Structure 1
Amino acid sequence: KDKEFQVLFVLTILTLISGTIFYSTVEGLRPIDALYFSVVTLTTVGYGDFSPQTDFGKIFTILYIFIGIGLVFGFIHKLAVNVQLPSILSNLVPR
């Protein structure tokens, strides 16, 4: 399960890297803002402080969302159940 976590973890980083590079290049964001934006998009928060301005950015965002949501939310699920939950349970007992 550490290896089920590791795979989704890696694939999430790669996905966020892809968005950082595209939005920094095509939409002209600073790298930190492109990552932030990629995260705010794929978790569906969508503040809108940043949003794509070019048609190439709009089209990319459509595809990035559909390809990216299932991965991101899979990782969050694995994180919650296989990492966060056990550590919570361990805290309720003194060794």
Structure 2
Amino acid sequence: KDKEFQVLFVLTILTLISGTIFYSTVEGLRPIDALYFSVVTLTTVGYGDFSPQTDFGKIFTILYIFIGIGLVFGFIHKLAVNVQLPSILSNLVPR
């Protein structure tokens, strides 16, 4: 399960790296803003402080969302049940 977590962890990093590079390059975001914009889109928070201004960006976002949401939510799920939950349980009993 650490190896189930690790495949979804890596893939998520590679996916945010993807949006980071595209949005930095094409839409002109500082690298730090691209990553934050990539994370705010794929988790569907969607603040709207950054948003794609070019047609090339609007199209990329359509696909990135569909391809990206499934992964991201899956990592989060793996993260919560397989890492957060056990550590919570372990805190309720002392060693």
**Deviation of residue 77 (structure 1)?**
0.2
Q: What is the match of residue 82 of structure 2?
A: 82
**Deviation of residue 19 (structure 1)?**
0.2
**Deviation of residue 10 (structure 1)?**
0.1
**Deviation of residue 83 (structure 1)?**
0.1
Q: Cα deviations across residues 57-90 of structure 1 (Å, max 9, x unaligned)?
A: 0000000000000000000000000000000000
Structure 1 gap ranges (5+): none
**Deviation of residue 26 (structure 1)?**
0.1
TM-score, normalization: structure 2? Answer: 1.00
**Deviation of residue 18 (structure 1)?**
0.2
TM-score, normalization: structure 1? Answer: 1.00
**Deviation of residue 94 (structure 1)?**
0.4
* CA distance in structure 2 between the aligned counterparts of 1:13 and 1:63, rounded to whole angstroms: 17
Alignment size in residue pairs: 95
* CA distance in structure 1 between the aligned counterparts of 2:67 and 2:58, rounded to whole angstroms: 14
* CA distance in structure 1 between the aligned counterparts of 2:78 and 2:63, rounded to whole angstroms: 24
**Deviation of residue 50 (structure 1)?**
0.2
RMSD: 0.1
**Deviation of residue 52 (structure 1)?**
0.1
**Deviation of residue 4 (structure 1)?**
0.0
Where 1:21 maps in the other structure, the secondary structure is helix
* CA distance in structure 2 between the aligned counterparts of 1:64 and 1:94, rounded to whole angstroms: 44
Runs of at least 4 residues of structure 1 off by over 4 A?
Answer: none
* CA distance in structure 2 between the aligned counterparts of 1:72 and 1:13, rounded to whole angstroms: 9
The answer to whether residue 58 in structure 2 is matched with residue 58 in structure 1 is: yes
Q: Cα deviations across residues 14-59 of structure 1 (Å, max 9, x unaligned)?
A: 0000000000000000000000000000000000000000000000
Sequence identity percentage: 100
